Amino acid sequence: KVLRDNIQGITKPAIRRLARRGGVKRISGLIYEETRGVLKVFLENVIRDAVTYTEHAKRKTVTAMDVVYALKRQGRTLYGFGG
Amino acid sequence: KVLRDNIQGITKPAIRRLARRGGVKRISGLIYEETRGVLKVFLENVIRDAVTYTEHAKRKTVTAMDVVYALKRQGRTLYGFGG
Amino acid sequence: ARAKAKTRSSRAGLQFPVGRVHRLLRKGNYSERVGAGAPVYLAAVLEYLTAEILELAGNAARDNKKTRIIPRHLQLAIRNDEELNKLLGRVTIAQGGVLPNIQAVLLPK
Amino acid sequence: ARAKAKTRSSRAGLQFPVGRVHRLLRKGNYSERVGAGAPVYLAAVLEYLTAEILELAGNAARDNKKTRIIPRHLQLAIRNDEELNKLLGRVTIAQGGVLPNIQAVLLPK
Amino acid sequence: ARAKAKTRSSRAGLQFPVGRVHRLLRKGNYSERVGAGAPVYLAAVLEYLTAEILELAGNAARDNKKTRIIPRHLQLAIRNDEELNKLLGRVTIAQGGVLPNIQAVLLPK
Amino acid sequence: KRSRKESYSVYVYKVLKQVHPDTGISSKAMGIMNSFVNDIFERIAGEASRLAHYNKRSTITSREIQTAVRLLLPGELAKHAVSEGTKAVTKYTSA
Amino acid sequence: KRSRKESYSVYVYKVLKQVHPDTGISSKAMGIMNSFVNDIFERIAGEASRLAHYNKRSTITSREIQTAVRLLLPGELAKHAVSEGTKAVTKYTSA
Amino acid sequence: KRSRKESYSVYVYKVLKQVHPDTGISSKAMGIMNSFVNDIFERIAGEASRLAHYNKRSTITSREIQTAVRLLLPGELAKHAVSEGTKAVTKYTSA
Amino acid sequence: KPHRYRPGTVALREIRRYQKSTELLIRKLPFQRLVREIAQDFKTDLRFQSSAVMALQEASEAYLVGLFEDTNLAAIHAKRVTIMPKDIQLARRIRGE
Amino acid sequence: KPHRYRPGTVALREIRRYQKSTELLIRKLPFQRLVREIAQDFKTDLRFQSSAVMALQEASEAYLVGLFEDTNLAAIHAKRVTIMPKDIQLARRIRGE
DNA sequence: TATGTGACACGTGCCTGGAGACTAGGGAGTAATCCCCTTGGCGGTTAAAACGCGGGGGACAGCGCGTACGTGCGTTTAAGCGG
DNA sequence: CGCTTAAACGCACGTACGCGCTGTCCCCCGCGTTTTAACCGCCAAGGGGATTACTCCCTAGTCTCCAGGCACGTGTCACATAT
């Protein structure tokens, strides 16, 4: 239930996979934690938005339609979830 | 009637002034024409839409309020000319 | 006693539904009246765009010898058109991937 | 037999015109119906925002010993607040100038 | 008694006269009956090809800074589209002239 | 007893069959196309709404939609859309 | 007193202003279009007639002329002509 | 004279004298603040309209105004805007 | 001797693979667990559509991968092939994050 | 001896001065000439409000200046102080342009 | 190249949303005007641009170097799938 | 919860790569001078933006009725997987 450091649940080889899909050749060891913090900031922005939608929606559970509204609020529109 | 060359009217010392406002300490000689081209692209992108407003406003006089509309269309909203 | 039912989409000669787009625009609260040719024109524009991206997806599928459109083919079609890339520079696609693209300095020798 | 025509801004203890804002919302076509407390809440939020930005502008004008607020003071106020700058990063002020900013690598030894 | 006469050109919604083309095919001795949609198809493909060659001609005229198209524009347009050129290799245009074309060894040095 | 939900499925599937009779579809690609068609729909509709406000018109006409196409759609897609849509305006005008 | 003579001028003019409102036309270029539409007309017409003879079909339908335009016109122009004619004949089928 | 043109000058001046009786205002800064308040107003109105259609709400009320101002305003601005708005809503509730 | 590729060859092969491939680069269960971890901080006992977690997913690595070609452009601008987090900082700050 | 400042000193003083200043750095009437020249490329012989001209001048100068801070960030990120147009192209590519 | 399969795709009920008939009236098209705003142009002037010399500061190549990821192989466990 | 491997970790050895330093060359700002056209500023002119009126085109809305597109069920072959 109570969760502690799942930011490191995103593994370093997963980050290497992400860099290789971006075509990055060589990755420093300092990269992974800084990118974890960056994605943490990004996720907490979008989940703050999606949450705010959700308690406004009078639903207790998050729906993806709130999620896509949150992403188009941030100028980061994503296609393919009934939007 | 027609005009042929006014892109050079944005002179090199004007670019130098803007770069010092931009905090640039040292400016190459290759900078000025490329900035003229980039500025040309930005101005034509905004003025095409400003035109499109102006005939859509059925006017032949270009107004600043349409300039505001065009600039805020491209995420470049300017304060000081609305209304 | 009454005229036989004839769709306004066929009156435009168009496929996207004129009545549905008109209803969406009326209930979408953009103006309290709307010109009759406006949703017809709108459905025509979206039909043109849907058509052209559908041929582009068809060519991407045929080049990769798959009979059915895949969001990978949508990604490859949408990113390789600079017109459509500038149309959708901020748009992401689910399970789309990226262009196969490498920098020259990343290649050996 | 009408009572004295009292103002809703004073009813909410506010400066911004509640009636004008409600009129703009009713004619800005955002919904056909507007809840009564909504323009009040909006006008209060706007009053708080305008109050804090004008307070910052007055502080900046006082810092430059200037008794009448300046768009340069507006720029210096709006860009030196983190919440305001992240609120209004893509918004530009006319004749604002820029923030005084020189990189340390630009600075000499 | 009778409805208003609405043209088959309007029924297709295309500019080329359907009735004239049907009349010509009736009096041109190609079959003893003709399908109704075939001259519609004819008018459609003719208007498509005239539209594209008129695009080419208008583009050439704007390249030559002329408002009205001339046979030189027609020549330059019809010779630089390979499908049109090999469509009309043996077809000659009045006052068209020739393509600007010089062999490499004709050039000095 | 379940409620009906709106989709663009039959229309996109038909226009796929005219543009490519032999080419199939995956379902989540249709979801992406649904998102695209909806997205451009409120882009053009919001442009039409604000352009109607700017000229103080309470009626949005095909002129406004065409202006919105010229604004949001760049380059060639705008002019081909204008050509086919004005064509469609004449087509409905005949009806 | 004169005799009425057919021309394809006015339809070329509607098409021209549909595709280029800014562009004029010279009358002998109009005559060249007249020669064009006539020449392609009996090219396709003889193609349809001889195809109708090949399958001994005494009636020429849209399938026949589609076959003929696929024969003479090459590829890109052929397939987009197919698309134009196909949507035209479907909207006539609805008409 | 001419027709009346809307402005927010008097309210800006009143709020200015609430926060700074001592200082003055330039009318160009007044115009900038008019642009500011119009921009924020249309922003909040836009997302309120969005949220009204998201919950399919025919009436726009203050709760999604709260939602929108919490959405746009970062942190401290958002909570104290909620505080000021809630205070004024309660005072108008008490007339 | 056993076979051993020189540095960059396996990197090139996996770059080409993941450019061609579209499937997820993140293990799904710790991702969902992290989403619940972050969301619980803002509102308690938040339940998730799995599709919502997935949409959060493709939004996340889309943002990351875009930041990654930004980082790569910064690195080739700096005449390098090894990226450092200051490149990511530069990309975010020029984007304005 | 006629005094000569060491290079970049006057450049930094200009940086301080023009960061302090708020006015437009573009000549107004050549800017209007270029604006009308590009206007007739879309529609010939229009009229202009001068307010539109200063609005375009403000927006153009602001966009250029922000582009130069991005260029300066790229150049110092490449451990240089002299900018080249490659830096500007890099910044435009980061901005998504 | 061999093989299952479920996802795509297609027949079917329906009701519901969209079209047909008709109207009120009102926003919208149009005429007029005028005046104010915009364009056109003319003289003085100087700052602003431009141009030349110069000379230091910076870009960048060369070269090495030590290290820090790349690559490779063994393990754990933890992600992943079914129910 | 119960298997069930895939990959995450982890170590280990090797290379190549950021980077540190310097040589070197050249580029561009500092400064002074020349030109020049920008700009004030002034005035003439006219043009169309905007305003008022007037009448009307459409269209939003209401009632009727019906067919279209989506839910529903199903079957089936393009593709996933294996080799």
Residue numbers in the entry:
A (entry chain B), B (entry chain F): 20 to 102
C (entry chain G), D (entry chain C), E (entry chain Q): 10 to 118
F (entry chain H), G (entry chain R), H (entry chain D): 30 to 124
I (entry chain A), J (entry chain E): 37 to 133
From the primary publication:
Here, we report cryo-EM structures of human H1-containing tetranucleosome arrays with four physiologically relevant NRLs. The structures show a zig-zag arrangement of nucleosomes, with nucleosomes 1 and 3 forming a stack. H1 binding to stacked nucleosomes depends on the NRL, whereas H1 always binds to the non-stacked nucleosomes 2 and 4. H1 contacts DNA with L1, the amino-terminal part of α2 together with L3, and α3 to stabilize the nucleosome and contribute to chromatin compaction.
In our structures, we observe a compact stacking of nucleosomes 1 and 3 that is similar to type I interactions with a contact formed between H2A–H2B dimers. The observed stacking does not allow for interactions between the H4 N-terminal tail of one nucleosome with the acidic patch of a stacked nucleosome and thus leaves the H4 tail free to engage in other interactions. Whereas the inter-nucleosome interactions appear to be very similar, we note a slight relative tilting of the stacking nucleosomes that positions their dyad axes almost parallel, in contrast to type I interactions in which the dyads are slightly tilted toward each other. H1 is absent from the stacked nucleosomes of the 4×177 array, but is present on nucleosome 1 in the 4×187 and 4×197 arrays, and is present on both stacked nucleosomes in the 4×207 array. Particularly high Δβ values are found for entry DNA at nucleosome 3, except for the 4×207 array, which is the only array where H1 is observed on nucleosome 3. H1 that is bound to nucleosome 1 always contacts entering linker DNA via its helix α3, whereas H1 on nucleosome 3 uses α3 to contact exiting linker DNA.
